[PDB]
Amino acid sequence: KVFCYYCDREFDDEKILVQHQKAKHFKCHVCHKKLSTAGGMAIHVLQVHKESVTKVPNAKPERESTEIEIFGMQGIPPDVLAAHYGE
Ligand SMILES: [Zn+2]
Ligand SMILES: [Zn+2]
């Protein structure tokens, strides 16, 4: 259907994808608040808990940067779409 930039898992639709992203990638490890982006998560952890997060949780090592803004399928670089749908 669609796939997650961070982990390459497939989902039947974007709504399900967004919930998975919030749960597995944008969740604060200390309090479990679900933020809306990986950047948002890292800023939360820092500001609330004073901890530095530089890797997205549960992500492939090449996808682990907090700096790219991914919302469901929105923001995925065209190269990564390519690599996923063949390779
Ligand atoms: Zn994922
Ligand atoms: Zn928290």
Numbering used by the authors: 10 to 96
What does the paper say about this structure?
To unravel the structural basis underlying target DNA recognition by OsSUF4, we carried out a crystallographic study of the zinc finger domain (aa 10–100) of OsSUF4. The structure was solved by a Se-SAD phasing method and refined up to 1.95 Å resolution. The OsSUF4 zinc finger domain contained two C2H2 type zinc finger motifs with different folding. The first zinc finger motif adopts a canonical C2H2 fold containing a short antiparallel β-sheet followed by one α-helix; instead of a β-sheet, the second zinc finger motif contains a coiled-coil. The zinc-coordinating cysteines and histidines located in the β-sheet/coiled-coil and the α-helix, respectively, and coordination of the two zinc ions are very similar. In many known C2H2-type zinc finger proteins, neighboring C2H2 motifs are connected by long and flexible loops; however, only two residues were shown to be embedded in the junction region of the two zinc finger motifs of OsSUF4, preventing them from synchronously nestling into the DNA major groove. Notably, the first zinc finger domain is enriched with positively charged residues (R18, K24, K31, K33, K36, and K43), forming an electropositive interface. The wild-type OsSUF4 zinc finger domain bound to the substrate DNA (5′-GGGTACGGAAATGGTA-3′) with a Kd value of 51.28 ± 3.68 μM, whereas R18A, K24A, K31A, K33A, K36A, K43A, and R18A/K33A/K36A/K43A mutants all lost their DNA-binding ability. Compared with wild-type OsSUF4, Hd3a promoter activation by all single mutant proteins was significantly reduced; a more dramatic reduction was observed for the R18A/K33A/K36A/K43A mutant. Taken together, our findings suggested that the positive residues within the surface of the first zinc finger motif are essential for target DNA binding by OsSUF4.
OsSUF4 encodes a C2H2-type zinc finger transcription factor. OsSUF4 comprises two conserved C2H2-type zinc finger domains at the N-terminus and a large proline-rich domain at the C-terminus. OsSUF4 physically interacts with SDG725 and recognizes a 7-bp DNA element within the promoter regions of the rice florigen genes RICE FLOWERING LOCUS T1 (RFT1) and Heading date 3a (Hd3a) to promote rice flowering. The C-terminal domain of OsSUF4 interacts with SDG725 and the N-terminal zinc finger domain of OsSUF4 is responsible for DNA binding.
